[PDB]
Write a protein that binds this ligand. Structure first.
Ligand SMILES: [Co+2]
Ligand SMILES: [Co+2]
Lengths: 128, 128
């Protein structure tokens, strides 16, 4: 068994698609639309659904805003260069809430950012 | 790059651990405590963090409830036996919001359940 995906409702499908792909480097894996339930989906990830856990972006027709709440935490993604990522994100529809840097009493470099809809994303970096 | 994990805040750490492991078949990968900020973490998954995505459970001391909101959707997991999981769930602190059964317009068996904190979980009975 394995983790397949995490679904998040977005206010604007293409906007989220652009962010996850163009900014974060993911690939659009597949899309779909459903007239009965009035929604469109977009699956984005760093690998195919058979190989990795991805993200399910859900767009409910005519719905551009939700209540984030206080329960949901975030999604953590690995990055080659957190600082670079941060800059790219902040300049392309995102927001940096925690500048890139080591964790207190640690050496591991991390950052926290927000996507176009306010979703928190944790970036974890993987002799200049 | 890769998707590392999805973080969810819970009202009772152990309760949550018991659920993901005992009911869903996950394993406790690691746990940590942060006395400074008064919170505890537990990582649960089907495989090692180095290879796949896992779930990060956050317990803030003295906090037993949160506001779920309308944004977060769910986490989808591949399941060995959907019907069985539903049974197990139903009798081990959980609700089954969608009985195990083929997907509308498909053949793939799926179900929907709730964890002890009301989080939605999609169970899917699915190189080489
Ligand atoms: Co995290
Ligand atoms: Co789903």
């Amino acid at each position: 068994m394995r983790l397949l995906h995490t679904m998040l409702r977005v206010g604007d499908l293409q906007r989220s698609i652009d962010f996850y792909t163009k900014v974060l480097g993911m690939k659009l894996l597949r899309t779909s639309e459903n007239p009965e339930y009035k929604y469109s989906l977009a699956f984005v990830g760093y690998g195919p659904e058979t190989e990795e856990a991805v993200i399910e972006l859900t767009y409910n027709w005519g719905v551009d805003k939700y209540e984030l709440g206080t329960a949901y935490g975030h999604i953590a993604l690995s990055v080659d260069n957190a600082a670079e990522a941060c800059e790219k994100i902040r300049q392309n529809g995102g927001n940096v809430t925690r500048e890139a840097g080591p964790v207190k009493g640690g050496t591991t470099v991390i950052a926290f950012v927000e996507d176009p809809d306010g979703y928190k994303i944790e970036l974890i970096e993987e002799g200049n």
